[PDB]
Amino acid sequence: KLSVSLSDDDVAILDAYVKRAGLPSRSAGLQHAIRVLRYPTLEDDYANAWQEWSAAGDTDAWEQTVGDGVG
Amino acid sequence: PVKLSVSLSDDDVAILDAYVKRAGLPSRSAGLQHAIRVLRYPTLEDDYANAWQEWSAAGDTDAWEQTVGDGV
Amino acid sequence: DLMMRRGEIWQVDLDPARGSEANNQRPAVVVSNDRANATATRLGRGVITVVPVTSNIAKVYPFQVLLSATTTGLQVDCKAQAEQIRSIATERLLRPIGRVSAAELAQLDEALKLHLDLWS
Amino acid sequence: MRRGEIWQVDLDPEANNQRPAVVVSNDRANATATRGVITVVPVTSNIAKVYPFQVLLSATTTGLQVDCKAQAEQIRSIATERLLRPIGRVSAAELAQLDEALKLHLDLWS
Amino acid sequence: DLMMRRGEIWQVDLDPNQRPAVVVSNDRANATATRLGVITVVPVTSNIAKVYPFQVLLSATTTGLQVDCKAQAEQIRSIATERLLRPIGRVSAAELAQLDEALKLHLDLWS
Amino acid sequence: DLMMRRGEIWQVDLDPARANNQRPAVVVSNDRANATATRLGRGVITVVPVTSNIAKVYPFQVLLSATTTGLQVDCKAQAEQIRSIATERLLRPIGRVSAAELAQLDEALKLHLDLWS
Numbered sequence: 321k322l323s324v325s326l327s328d329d330d331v332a333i334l335d336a337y338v339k340r341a342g343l344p345s346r347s348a349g350l351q352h353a354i355r356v357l358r359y360p361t362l363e364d365d366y367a368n369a370w371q372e373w374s375a376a377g378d379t380d381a382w383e384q385t386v387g388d389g390v391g
Numbered sequence: 392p393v394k395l396s397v398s399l400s401d402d403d404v405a406i407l408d409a410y411v412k413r414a415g416l417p418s419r420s421a422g423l424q425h426a427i428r429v430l431r432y433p434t435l436e437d438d439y440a441n442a443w444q445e446w447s448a449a450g451d452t453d454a455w456e457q458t459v460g461d462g463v
Numbered sequence: 464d465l466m467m468r469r470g471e472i473w474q475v476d477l478d479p480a481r482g483s484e485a486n487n488q489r490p491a492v493v494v495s496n497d498r499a500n501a502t503a504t505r506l507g508r509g510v511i512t513v514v515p516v517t518s519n520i521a522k523v524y525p526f527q528v529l530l531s532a533t534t535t536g537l538q539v540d541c542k543a544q545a546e547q548i549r550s551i552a553t554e555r556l557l558r559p560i561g562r563v564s565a566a567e568l569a570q571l572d573e574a575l576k577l578h579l580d581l582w583s
Numbered sequence: 584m585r586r587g588e589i590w591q592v593d594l595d596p597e598a599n600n601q602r603p604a605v606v607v608s609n610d611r612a613n614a615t616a617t618r619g620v621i622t623v624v625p626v627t628s629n630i631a632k633v634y635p636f637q638v639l640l641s642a643t644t645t646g647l648q649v650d651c652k653a654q655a656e657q658i659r660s661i662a663t664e665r666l667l668r669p670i671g672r673v674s675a676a677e678l679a680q681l682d683e684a685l686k687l688h689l690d691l692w693s
Numbered sequence: 694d695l696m697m698r699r700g701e702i703w704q705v706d707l708d709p710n711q712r713p714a715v716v717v718s719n720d721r722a723n724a725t726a727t728r729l730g731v732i733t734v735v736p737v738t739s740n741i742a743k744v745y746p747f748q749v750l751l752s753a754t755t756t757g758l759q760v761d762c763k764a765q766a767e768q769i770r771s772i773a774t775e776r777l778l779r780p781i782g783r784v785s786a787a788e789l790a791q792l793d794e795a796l797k798l799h800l801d802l803w804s
Numbered sequence: 805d806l807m808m809r810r811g812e813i814w815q816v817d818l819d820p821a822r823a824n825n826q827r828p829a830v831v832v833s834n835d836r837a838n839a840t841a842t843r844l845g846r847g848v849i850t851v852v853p854v855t856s857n858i859a860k861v862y863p864f865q866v867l868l869s870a871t872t873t874g875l876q877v878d879c880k881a882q883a884e885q886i887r888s889i890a891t892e893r894l895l896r897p898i899g900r901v902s903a904a905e906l907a908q909l910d911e912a913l914k915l916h917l918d919l920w921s
Contacts, residue, residue, distance in 0.1 A: 324420040331393045342569030347397040348692040353426035363502045365634040387477045388662040389620035391487040436840040438745040454707040460818045461773040462731035496690040549659045580609040583693040719918045770887045801834040804921040
């Protein structure tokens with residue numbers, strides 16, 4: 321547990337995010353923020369991972385399961 | 392200046408301190424201000440890419456280049 | 464302003480064959496993070512993760528969340544089944560319906576943490 | 584069926600279409616699944632890159648022949664009848680890494 | 694010899710070509726600049742299909758900009774005073790507050 | 805590819821014709837934009853021109869102390885000359901202002917642009 325000093329606008333942004341995302345606490349909001357700071361190229365990581373996945377044919381391999389448990 | 396008591400894991404505080412050292416910031420609080428702004432604008436990088444692409448794509452904006460040497 | 468993002472409800476095709484193959488056509492809540500979702504929308508293609516939704520309320524379990532027609536845009540009251548979570552190609556997105564309320568989204572986060580043993 | 588185990592999965596509708604995956608649904612849902620789906624994370628041997636939503640599983644403890652990676656971004660709930668046989672299980676550290684990768688991909692606070 | 698004030702939309706001459714821009718330098722610096730000098734402005738365009746966080750929607754007025762436009766704070770520029778031709782109008786205090794936020798976002802400034 | 809970062813001093817080309825009106829400038833745009841422009845190889849960077857005329861340092865200008873690596877003479881950043889330029893006008897990196905000098909430059913920008921609270 322720490323004590324931080326932020327501006328009124330900072331706490332307003334944080335509270336709006338926590339509200340929109342349905343998070344239980346400002347600490348949860350800040351955890352999301354830190355997790356975003358943590359991975360700067362995550363969008364790129366997803367693009368490349370999906371590219372590997374499609375290039376290997378794995379969506380065709382696993383697609384027979386897409387309807388399991390439903391219907 | 393609003394003050395908060397917040398609970399962050401050891402790993403989370405390590406990430407925050409690493410961002411602070413990385414960005415040459417004076418305190419964890421400044422680190423968290425940066426983090427909150429990032430929270431507010433999640434697609435900012437793509438926003439800049441698209442804004443620059445539209446700007447360069449418009450021919451009515453190249454004229455602004457003519458001012459690059461004003462005052463110097 | 465639905466943009467294919469987390470918390471949004473979309474009608475998706477869950478049939479392996481798709482085409483003229485009938486049924487397996489369900490609403491679903493997007494639960495993949497919005498960096499992934501925004502990447503899929505930017506590329507026009509990707510792999511998202513959704514929680515299927517059913518109008519057969521039946522017995523409600525702690526890993527399922529009641530979704531109300533008043534807020535979601537669904538025609539009837541439904542139930543998100545976190546135990547049926549699955550990643551799908553964005554090609555299987557059919558039609559945006561709306562999004563869950565903030566309360567419903569919080570409880571769907573709870574249900575996911577329970578189903579996947581991610582409570583801390 | 585327990586969380587963290589690697590199992591061989593039947594992906595047929597025919598021939599030999601079977602692939603390993605890690606069980607990530609909790610043990611009790613696994614025990615009551617046939618009342619039915621088990622939630623698994625696919626695994627691949629291509630480890631040229633390992634992204635933050637993916638976890639390396641070390642051939643020492645896997646039971647697989649080579650180092651692999653669990654692709655938490657490809658999580659899928661599948662029919663219980665597809666779980667053929669157990670091949671191995673991840674270490675406690677690998678399973679914690681998989682927890683973090685799942686929270687990351689699914690935007691889940693902790 | 695006109696006075697140019699922060700928040701005013703001005704028509705600027707880009708000749709070595711005439712474009713609207715919002716004055717964002719403070720009025721002390723502007724008053725000095727008319728006598729010296731450069732004024733810092735934010736270019737305005739009519740392409741409002743998307744308004745990114747470092748841009749501000751300027752709603753059309755009857756006497757100013759006839760169509761909705763946007764101020765692009767990511768294109769902020771300091772230009773020679775002589776280029777400032779005429780005032781077109783004033784952004785509202787709400788539009789200028791949004792422009793302050795866009796400038797702080799783009800320039801990594803707080804408070 | 806050279807990563808442009810806020811608070812770093814780059815040699816920039818400010819001539820409209822692209823004539824040896826090149827001079828140092830401090831990058832002041834945020835590093836999300838800067839890193840995007842770096843990653844894509846195109847974009848627009850916002851900089852503050854620097855001059856070796858340190859006759860008087862007004863509150864909207866910042867004294868930059870000379871270093872062994874970067875600027876060899878003391879200079880001043882002119883926040884009143886802030887301008888956005890295409891990335892191809894950034895020629896080569898020279899150095900980096902201190903943390904204190906960058907805070908000073910924050911205050912100078914907020915003063916020149918009326919962004920103070």
